[PDB]
Amino acid sequence: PATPITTLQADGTHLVDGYGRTVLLHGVNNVDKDAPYLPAGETLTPQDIDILVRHGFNTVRLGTSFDALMPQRGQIDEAYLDRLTGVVDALTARGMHVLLDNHQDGLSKAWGGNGFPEWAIESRPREWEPNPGFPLYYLMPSLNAGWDEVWGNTHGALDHLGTALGALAERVEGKPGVMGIELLNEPWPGSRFLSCFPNGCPDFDRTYQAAMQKLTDAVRAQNPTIPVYWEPNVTWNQMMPSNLFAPPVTPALTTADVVFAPHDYCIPSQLAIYLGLPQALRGLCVPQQDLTWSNIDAITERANVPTVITSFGDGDPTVLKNTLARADERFIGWQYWHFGAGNATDPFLGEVGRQLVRTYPQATAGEPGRMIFDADNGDFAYRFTPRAATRPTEIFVSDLHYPDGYAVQVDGGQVTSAPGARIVTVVADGSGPVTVKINRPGSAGAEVPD
Ligand code: NA
């Protein structure tokens, strides 16, 4: 008898459900980049969704786009919105929190990418201008001029985008399982971009933040409570720090329910995939990804807002641990890149799923303390400080790591769920801390880190 899904509300760095619990989101991306968008029979099937439920994922970052929403100047495609909300409804019905991602790569279809409709941008690539495709096409001069039109609002592209996202926000208003709208995927600074290296670009980030605030105000005009997800400018992904929410250079946040939405990629991993460069360069992944997490802690410290890693992974099993362990350390959730529609087989049964499919606290009736999961043998430990809530702590138990069943021990509380349940429910005995251990019956188990 599943817990009805609610809206999520930011309270400091916590995402808090309607029962007063602190929520941890683990999930996947699902993004349609090509017209026609979300056409019948090519969206997530009941079976696709069963895969996600079975492995205990509770969030989908669902792609939409400016092009999908407004495929002709000033005209909302209301039929696209019907199809999108059909997908949203199928997901939230099965307990998935849906983050609506306003997606783009390479600005637009004019460059072989996606996102902005061609009618909205004047700049176009030349026949003689080399296009190396994704991801290096961000170095194309004509693509950079496109981005300048965006940040300059030269032809009202941001005004139109505001309208488009406002229309989306209006359509999903009042739906409990919608976690928010992510304003723009991987924003590129355009011709300004070398100012971001090698130490960040305070000036551009003032421009970018004003743009995001403007889109936020357009969204909130239509749907006054919907959360908004803000990415750092994408030179983040080339190790440059963000200057968001950093007065006096950029304004402090005065908008409620804003969540930070960084990506966490290993450069050499991505270079090997898209450029065919040597895979053994991934020896650099750990120090490089440690830098990103340090940048995240800095945002957390000065802004005191939540963070969700909105994409990472991209099929490389060797880099996952970097994200997963650091996220666990900070009790930060994530959405893996990428989960496609119409799986004939379950894609989480190999090396990738072994690490993504985890035992973890979907919702905690308390302040999270330290947590650890061992993805080889399933050992799990978690401690938290009880807080008033109207539902118990719910911990999803991996369906992959316990072939002989699992055992549970609780100190400071009681397990109220049945033997072998996919969800362990835990009620606190009192005000003191609760420690939960879940493991194979013959394991000595894990210890809470400290
Ligand atoms: Na499509």
Biggest CA–CA distance in the chain, Å, is 71
What's the angle, vertex CA 429, arms to CA 426 and CA 435, rounded to 5? 55
Tokens 């029979």, residue?
A: 41
Q: How far apart, in whole angstroms, are the C-alpha atoms of residue 38 and residue 5? A: 24
Query: Measured between alpha carbons, how far is 211 from 183 in angstroms, rounded to an integer?
Result: 10
Residues within 5 Å of ion ligand 1, judged at the Cβ atom? 32, 34, 37
Tell me the CA–centroid distance for residue 43 and ligand 1, in Å.
9
Q: From the CA of 115, how far away is ligand 1's center (Å)?
A: 12
Q: Compute the distance from residue 83 Cα to the ligand 1 centre, in Å.
A: 11
| Cβ–Cβ < 8 Å for 360, 395 | yes
DSSP 168-193: HHHHTTT-TTEEEEE--SS---GGGG
DSSP per-residue codes, 233-264:
PGGGGGTPPP-TT-TTTSPPP-SSSEEE--EE
Q: How many A from CA of 296 to the centre of ligand 1?
A: 33
Residue pair 387/359 in contact (Cβ under 8 Å)? The answer is no
Within 10 A of 280 (CB to CB), how many other CB atoms are there? 9
Rg (CA), the chain: 22
Resolution (A): 2.2
Domains of the chain: residue spans and CATH:
9-357 (3.20.20.80), 358-450 (2.60.40.1180)
How far, in Å, from the CA of 12 to the mean position of ligand 1?
37
| Chain length of the chain | 450
Q: Which amino acid is at 265?
A: Y
Angle formed at CA 192 by CA 302 and CA 136, multiple of 5 degrees: 100
CA–centroid distance, 33 to ligand 1, in Å, is 6
CB 283 within 8 A of CB 330: no
Cβ neighbours of residue 101 closer than 8 Å, sequence gap 6 or more: 29, 31, 61, 62, 63, 64, 182, 185, 310
Single-letter code of the amino acid located at 122: E
Q: What 3-state DSSP class applies to 67?
A: helix
